[PDB]
Design an enzyme around this catalytic site. Sequence first.
Site, PDB file in Angstrom:
ATOM      1  N   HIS A 265      53.466 -56.203 163.985  1.00  0.00           N
ATOM      2  CA  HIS A 265      53.263 -57.300 164.938  1.00  0.00           C
ATOM      3  C   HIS A 265      52.989 -58.659 164.266  1.00  0.00           C
ATOM      4  O   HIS A 265      52.894 -59.656 164.976  1.00  0.00           O
ATOM      5  CB  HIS A 265      52.214 -56.991 166.028  1.00  0.00           C
TER       6      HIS A 265
ATOM      7  N   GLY B  34      41.869 -61.457 163.173  1.00  0.00           N
ATOM      8  CA  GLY B  34      42.161 -61.551 161.746  1.00  0.00           C
ATOM      9  C   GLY B  34      41.943 -60.247 160.991  1.00  0.00           C
ATOM     10  O   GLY B  34      42.322 -60.128 159.827  1.00  0.00           O
TER      11      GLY B  34
ATOM     12  N   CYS C 177      43.376 -57.357 161.731  1.00  0.00           N
ATOM     13  CA  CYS C 177      44.596 -56.541 161.740  1.00  0.00           C
ATOM     14  C   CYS C 177      45.106 -56.296 160.332  1.00  0.00           C
ATOM     15  O   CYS C 177      45.120 -57.220 159.519  1.00  0.00           O
ATOM     16  CB  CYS C 177      45.663 -57.171 162.625  1.00  0.00           C
TER      17      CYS C 177
END
Lengths: 298, 302
Positions: free
Chosen positions: A41, A136, A138
């Site tokens: 993503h 942040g 991820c």
Amino acid sequence: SGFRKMAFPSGKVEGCMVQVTCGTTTLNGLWLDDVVYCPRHVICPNYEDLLIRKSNHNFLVQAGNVQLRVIGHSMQNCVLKLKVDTANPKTPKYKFVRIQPGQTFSVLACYNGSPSGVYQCAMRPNFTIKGSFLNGSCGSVGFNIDYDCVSFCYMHHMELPTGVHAGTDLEGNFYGPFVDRQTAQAAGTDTTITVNVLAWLYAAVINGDRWFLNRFTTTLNDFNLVAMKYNYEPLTQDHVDILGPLSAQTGIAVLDMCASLKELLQNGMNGRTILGSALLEDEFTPFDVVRQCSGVTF
Amino acid sequence: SGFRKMAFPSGKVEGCMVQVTCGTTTLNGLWLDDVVYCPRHVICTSEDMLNPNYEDLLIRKSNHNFLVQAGNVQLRVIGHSMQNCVLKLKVDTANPKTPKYKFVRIQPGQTFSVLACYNGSPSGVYQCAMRPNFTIKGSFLNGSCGSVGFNIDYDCVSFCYMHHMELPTGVHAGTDLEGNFYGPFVDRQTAQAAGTDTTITVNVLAWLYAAVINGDRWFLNRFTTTLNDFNLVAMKYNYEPLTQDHVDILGPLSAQTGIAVLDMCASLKELLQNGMNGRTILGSALLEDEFTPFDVVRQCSG
Ligand SMILES: Cc1ccc2cncc(NC(=O)Cc3cccc(Cl)c3)c2c1
Ligand SMILES: [Cl-]
């Protein structure tokens, strides 16, 4: 003495954290050999179509104050694999392992490729993790250490509306019925990891906490009938066998500890605590208890 | 020193015994909070006993049909319901003498105290064990139905048994306090027989450890055994199989006396082969199986 929620030393994993930027999106990547793994993503959905429009130089990868050059890109399920020119000199001995619900692992939470904290999690029976993540995070990874080998088992992808977290194994396969897109998704009804609560009761016994013990035993079937009523996971013969060493060390048969759990579920703690907790703790596996009550090193 | 068959003090249970009368039938009930628990066969006319439809017989009853007597005070029944083989008579007074309690279902080999009652009045207390064939070798006369079995670990009474019937061999059958019978028994006058009884092996080993703690080692030997070879021998003497759970449970006693469980198993194997030869162990000429590992630790140490 003492029983703490203990994570594995994060050092072998810290040397693998990099920052991955693609357009306006910045998240974390895991640099192992000459590949950077991160959530797909980061390119955001038709991921094949969005990825085909990207070039290698669109992904800015930063390892400390050094910008790595991306020489290739490919997608494996929900993870993006960015081939880089430099092999990570700090690459440890590693495996990609997929874990089962009830298993625990350490999470090295990162922001901008920089590790900020480490905590111990358990993959809930509903395949979510009750983690601690901000925007942040991820790409932050979950791992275990097996002697000198790091077993990567989780990559953070998203937060569900209930504050719980969803992610994948390192091959990009999500844990649970989740997808990596902005849509209505909910964590299913959670349950308690029964084998882990029993393991934690054994740890309490090893630490001198014995008030919950009783003279009673139970059948595995009678216990599963009781446990199903309290939203507890069924205890299998495999779990009973896994609890064997702890049962032998403390002299309390698994079905004996099960009768202690049955009374605790029907009667509560009655103002008392077990290992400083007023709730039954389910995020220590039988192996975590043995490792912490023996002193295994890495 | 000394090892006795010891019952729990019965005081907390005595304050719960009431007399329940329904027609010609009088038995005992257990008054806890505002409920009186008793065997559902109190509603039967002995002519029902063979094939009673308890739902059918109970629906024909009213609250005033059940006379409940607590000492010299008649309690007022304000409701009635059946849970398995137990009748729950809701009364208009909560028992002021209600202790801290739990309803626990026990496994064969477990021990408990029995407060034998007749006409709601306690006459005696003894120690019992749930036999592997789910019967109890109690001491009960007619009118003892509703007498309860319990353990009093700490300040909480754990009710584990309610007496319902006597089988043709003089042994007794009953239920936990939720009305579920122990064993394949039914509250019917039909042909029912207790299955072949077996010796509670883990309890005999616990009792051998109690004898060692009390200074008796005559029966010990230099041998050990595999768990499988012990079970092959034990089965031939009608002894229950000893499981790894039992071996683990015996751990503390093994640690306290310095005699390994399989070591103590070899000693039991030898006693089974030789008998006692005019000797006794803890004043008994037979191997005692109605003391659990937990009973031995409580009595010999604290
Ligand atoms: C005459 C006698 C002697 C000793 C006794 C000892 N305990 C109980 C008694 N009676 C019963 O068993 C009543 C009964 C019969 C059939 C089915 C049920 Cl569920 C109950 C006793 C009676
Ligand atoms: Cl039990």
